Amino acid sequence: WSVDDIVKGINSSNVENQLQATQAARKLLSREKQPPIDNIIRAGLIPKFVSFLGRTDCSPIQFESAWALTNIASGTSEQTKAVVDGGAIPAFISLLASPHAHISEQAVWALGNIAGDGSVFRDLVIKYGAVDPLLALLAVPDMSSLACGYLRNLTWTLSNLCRNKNPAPPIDAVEQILPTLVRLLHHDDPEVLADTCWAISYLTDGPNERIGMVVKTGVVPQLVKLLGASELPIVTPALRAIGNIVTGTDEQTQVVIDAGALAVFPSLLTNPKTNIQKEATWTMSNITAGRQDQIQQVVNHGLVPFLVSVLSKADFKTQKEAVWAVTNYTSGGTVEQIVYLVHCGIIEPLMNLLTAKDTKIILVILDAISNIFQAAEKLGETEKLSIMIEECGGLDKIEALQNHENESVYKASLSLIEKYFS
Amino acid sequence: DDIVKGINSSNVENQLQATQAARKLLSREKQPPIDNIIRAGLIPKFVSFLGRTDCSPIQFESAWALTNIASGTSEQTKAVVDGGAIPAFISLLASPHAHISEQAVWALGNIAGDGSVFRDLVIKYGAVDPLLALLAVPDMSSLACGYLRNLTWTLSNLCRNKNPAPPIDAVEQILPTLVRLLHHDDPEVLADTCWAISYLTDGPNERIGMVVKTGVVPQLVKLLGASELPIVTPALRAIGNIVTGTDEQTQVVIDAGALAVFPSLLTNPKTNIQKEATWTMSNITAGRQDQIQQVVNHGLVPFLVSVLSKADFKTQKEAVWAVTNYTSGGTVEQIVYLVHCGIIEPLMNLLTAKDTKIILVILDAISNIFQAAEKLGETEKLSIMIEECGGLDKIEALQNHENESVYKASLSLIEKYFS
């Protein structure tokens, strides 16, 4: 239909004719190829659709109107603003309580789409009171009573309320939403679990307080459980969430360790997906930046060789992650922990990266070597370490770094040579 | 407290040693007490160090300390920005030392990736021109791999995020460098450049048109065929976005060869690639009749039947749209061909899905096929075909008053063709 035919149908008293016009509106607006949103807005149909949302006696017009408004709101930011300024959010909220599952589900879908448009529209959805009725839909004793698709839609909408920054989700909304998320994390549907794991990863990517609210729920063991799921769509967000948690305090890290996360890292560090490998080595770098007893547990789980192997044969971006793992280890670790690291063969791959162009990495590696030499001084075995570095051609690499083109690297390698190779 | 004292020392080396210690202290992203660091007022000290052209190490070290601070909460990034770091970093881009430039590039990319507001501040202080001048060299292979990757990531962060989208002028400055970067051979540079274009193409048609007019689409299409998933994924997103634009923008994509690649995309083992490619195809079948005809000409209809029949539900849903868009805009002959390719049975089997929107969309597709049948006088033959594959039973199952929309749609088809 045309913008004229639809406007005539919508300005008709014949409610059935109004329904047909809105359906035509749906068909023109549902195409993601040139939906005539601008002229439909200029026609004043947004308030008409919003009003139709309230026609409880005609569920099809509510469903069709909700679909039209969502399609409009999925366009430019100004079009989303036009739908929100049209009063669509309260009207969608009123549809949440419909006795018709597909009607409430359309309202959930519409509200999740608005919220996922960005942080300002998410906060509007929260501001107008969407969280309470959305969560009330999951207040049932057994979550298996709800259909799969219905639950996935709700889970995705809540995920969207947790997502995005600048600003982060309001504190109060996070507090209200969190208990429902932890429950969903014990549901058996893979899509629900993925979305929930993503929701928690969003929540834990933020200030320490947020990490604290997540860990306190006692959900970290379940995250750790899902860290070993076979479904990569589940493992990836679970690993990110755990990774975010170990960027917090030494205690928050200990909560991750106590749940058994380290036991899963033998597979994660060799996972054929390079992204899982990198994220796993990132997460370990933040663990080895913790206490010495936490470094000891990394050792106890046989994780050091995997780190060495990663440093030796992985891609450069993952090797950089491993450089930070090793340096943090050497920086906080005990002398015996450093000997073990050298006993794992760290020197040779560590020296091979000294041909990288990354100044930061070069300087971080030299610092690691300095920390290894310090452990040697405390034992009085710096001579064997020096020869060892020379044996694998490490010293030649260090001397190659004495190039005046890079004064920071020149001075760093010169200091190392004066103290231990002079 | 001792760290602040070292920073406020008159001896040059002592200040260097304090900020270096600060860099190392900040190196580790493990619960650092920055709140007091802001209270102590160290951010403005670092920023001043960046201007110390005569002492390259101090510049390097402070750049590292400020970027570490800028990679936390919004207030920490805000403190860094209000500290005048952004202009300082921009001044640092012109350094004759490569490893100093890079540090600034990295700091600016982190700030810009924090969000749209800081992205626009980075642009507003004038970062775009000096960032691009670093890539204005004749042979990009002369630049170190790590240095180019950093620059390319920073550019993609300057094209990322919306509400608001990047400013138009900055995008028009950046796009010609993005073009040249997509001819580089490094897989990471290509991935980041494709991501940047996918950001630029995720918006209104006028933004799409900025991209298309650069002439870059044929190179994007070539990358659609890369073996590296981390390249195919964003290239495919970009192409899919561009085909959500005008019919003419869609023709640019077809003319660049895209459809020859879809036999591989539609059967790709990554289910996400299948989904995005079927999404992309659905937007192409939503185009003009000659475009539908090119889809037909490139042998793709059997591929779309197979996807509708055997793919996962998320991909099947995109295939449903692709089919309905085809039957909505296609000729009678194109629709006959669709039926000849076997679309009826896989389409009817999806009428068991619980998604009301998908159900109504499938029924629309059926009605459109029946309209082609009416023009040919073969509505009975079509009904028989639908009844034979159990389709009619599936339509009748939809006769449930608990869902009035589905009941009304399914009732119309039953009354009109199955009375």
Helices (H), A31-87: 37-42, 45-53, 59-73, 77-85
Token output for A7: 């406007």
CA-to-CA dists, residue A94 to A91, A102, A103, B356, angstroms? 5, 14, 10, 20
Distance from CA of A394 to the nearest CA of B (A): 22
CA distance B392 to B418: 8
CA distance A32 to B264: 24
CB-count burial class (<10 Å; 0-12, 13-18, 19+) for B187: middle
User: Which residue on chain A is closest to B63 by alpha carbon?
Assistant: A360
Token output for B371: 């309209």
Longest dimension (CA), chain A: 96
Helices (H), B213-343: 217-223, 229-242, 247-255, 262-266, 271-285, 289-297, 301-310, 313-329, 332-340
Token output for B66: 């400020």
Residue A214: its H or E element? helix A208-216
User: Which residue on chain B is closest to A324 by alpha carbon?
Assistant: B28
Given an 8 Å threshold on Cβ–Cβ distance, is A166 in contact with B117?
A: yes
Calculate the CA dihedral of residues B24, B26, B30, B31 and round it to 10 degrees.
140
Contact B242, B234 (CB under 8 A): no
Identify the residue among A20, A23, A33 best suited for mutation to test binding to B, counting B beta carbons within 10 A and taking the highest. A33
Distance from CA of A138 to the nearest CA of B (A): 19
Contact A256, A246 (CB under 8 A): yes
Domain residue spans of chain A:
3-421
CA distance A95 to A134: 11
CA distance A399 to A402: 5
Nearest to A246 by CA among A274, A273, A223, A277: A223
CA distance B404 to A106: 14
Contact B356, A63 (CB under 8 A): yes
CA distance A80 to B7: 50
Given an 8 Å threshold on Cβ–Cβ distance, is B405 in contact with A60?
A: yes
CA distance B48 to B59: 9
CB-CB: which of B56, B283, B353 is closest to A408? B56
Chain center to CA of A206: 11
Identify the residue among B99, B291, B295 best suited for mutation to test binding to A, counting A beta carbons within 10 A and taking the highest. B99
Pairs of CB atoms within 8 A across A/B: 115
Contact B49, B8 (CB under 8 A): no
Q: What are phi and psi of A231, to 5 degrees?
A: -75, 120
Spatial neighbors of B95 by CB under 8 A, at least 6 apart, are: B53, B56, B59, B101, B104
Distance from CA of A371 to the nearest CA of B (A): 13
For tokens 């007091």, the residue is B36
Q: Residue B164: which region, alpha, beta or left (left: phi > 0; alpha: psi -120 to 50)?
A: beta
Given an 8 Å threshold on Cβ–Cβ distance, is B243 in contact with A359?
A: no
Nearest to B89 by CA among B72, B68, B111: B111
Contact B352, B396 (CB under 8 A): no
CA distance B295 to B309: 18
Query: From start to end of A246-330, where are the E strands?
Result: none
Spatial neighbors of A164 by CB under 8 A, at least 6 apart, are: A118, A119, A122, A202
B378 three-class SS:
coil
Token output for B202: 């995720």
Given an 8 Å threshold on Cβ–Cβ distance, is B354 in contact with A208?
A: no
Token output for B352: 């068991």
Token output for B49: 């160090």
Token output for A322: 């491993």
CA-to-CA dists, residue B268 to B69, B231, B238, B311, angstroms? 42, 14, 18, 11
CA-to-CA dists, residue A270 to A29, A353, B229, angstroms? 47, 20, 19
CA-to-CA dists, residue A215 to A169, A249, A256, B28, B347, angstroms? 18, 11, 9, 22, 46
User: DSSP string spanning B115-172?
Assistant: -HHHHHHHHHTT-HHHHHHTT-SS-GGGS-HHHHHHHHHHHHHHH---SSPPPHHHHH
CA distance A18 to A7: 9
Contact A32, B283 (CB under 8 A): yes
CA-to-CA dists, residue A117 to A40, A76, A81, A206, A417, angstroms? 20, 10, 11, 20, 56
Distance from CA of A339 to the nearest CA of B (A): 22
Q: Which residues of A touch B144 (CB under 8 A)?
A: 357
Chain center to CA of B400: 40
Cβ count within 10 A of residue B375: 11
CA distance A258 to A51: 54
| End-to-end alpha carbon distance in chain B | 88
CA distance B285 to B277: 12
Given an 8 Å threshold on Cβ–Cβ distance, is A317 in contact with B188?
A: yes
Token output for B342: 């076997």
Q: In A359-394, which positions are buried (b, 16+ CB within 10 angstroms) versus exposed (e)? A: bbbbbbbbbbbbbbbbbbeeeeebeebbebbeebeb
CA distance A284 to A262: 9
Q: In B262-279, which positions are buried (b, 16+ CB within 10 angstroms) versus exposed (e)? A: beebbebeeeebbbbbbb
Q: Examine residue A170 and say whether the peptide bond preceding it is cis (omega within 30 degrees of 0).
A: no
CA distance A81 to B73: 28
For tokens 């959305």, the residue is A134
CB-count burial class (<10 Å; 0-12, 13-18, 19+) for A313: exposed
Nearest to A325 by CA among A291, A292, A284: A284
Contact A137, A104 (CB under 8 A): yes
User: Which residue on chain A is closest to B408 by alpha carbon?
Assistant: A60
Contact B31, A294 (CB under 8 A): no
CA distance A230 to B301: 34
Helix pair B247-255, B229-242: axis angle to 10 deg: 140
Token output for A50: 């919003």
Given an 8 Å threshold on Cβ–Cβ distance, is A166 in contact with B404?
A: no
User: Which residue on chain A is closest to B405 by alpha carbon?
Assistant: A60
Which H, E and C letters describe A318-387, residue by residue?
HHHHHHHHHHHHHHHCCHHHHHHHHHCCCHHHHHHHHHCCCHHHHHHHHHHHHHHHHHHHHHCCHHHHHH
Residue B77: its H or E element? helix B74-82
- Identify the CATH number of the domain defined by range B1-418: 1.25.10.10
Token output for A6: 């639809």
Given an 8 Å threshold on Cβ–Cβ distance, is A27 in contact with B146?
A: no
User: DSSP string spanning A120-163?
Assistant: HHHHHHHHTT-HHHHHHTT-SS-GGGS-HHHHHHHHHHHHHHH-
- Identify the CATH number of the domain defined by range A3-421: 1.25.10.10
The DSSP code for A410 is H
Resolution to 1 decimal, in Å?
A: 2.1
CA-to-CA dists, residue B27 to A281, A285, A324, A335, B72, angstroms? 16, 12, 9, 21, 13
Distance from CA of A204 to the nearest CA of B (A): 12
Distance from CA of A60 to the nearest CA of B (A): 5
Q: Which residues of A touch B81 (CB under 8 A)?
A: none
Token output for A233: 């769509």
CA distance A318 to A315: 5
∠ CA B181-B278-B204, nearest 5°, is 55
- Helix then strand count (H, E) for chain A reads 28, 0
Given an 8 Å threshold on Cβ–Cβ distance, is B286 in contact with A32?
A: yes
Q: Which residues of B touch A118 (CB under 8 A)?
A: 162-163
Cβ count within 10 A of residue A151: 22
Calculate the CA dihedral of residues B158, B131, B180, B98 and round it to 10 degrees.
-130
Q: What are phi and psi of A100, to 5 degrees?
A: -95, 115
User: Which residue on chain B is closest to A368 by alpha carbon?
Assistant: B24
Q: Which residues of A touch B102 (CB under 8 A)?
A: 359
CA distance B227 to A298: 36
User: Which residue on chain B is closest to A59 by alpha carbon?
Assistant: B404
Spatial neighbors of B406 by CB under 8 A, at least 6 apart, are: B356, B359, B360, B363, B398, B400
Token output for A286: 């933040």
Token output for B404: 């009035």
Contact B379, B335 (CB under 8 A): no
CA distance B15 to B3: 10
Residue A245: its H or E element? helix A232-245
CA distance B135 to B141: 11
CA distance B46 to B196: 31
Spatial neighbors of B337 by CB under 8 A, at least 6 apart, are: B296, B301
Breaks in chain A listed by the residue before each, with C–N > 2.5 Å? none
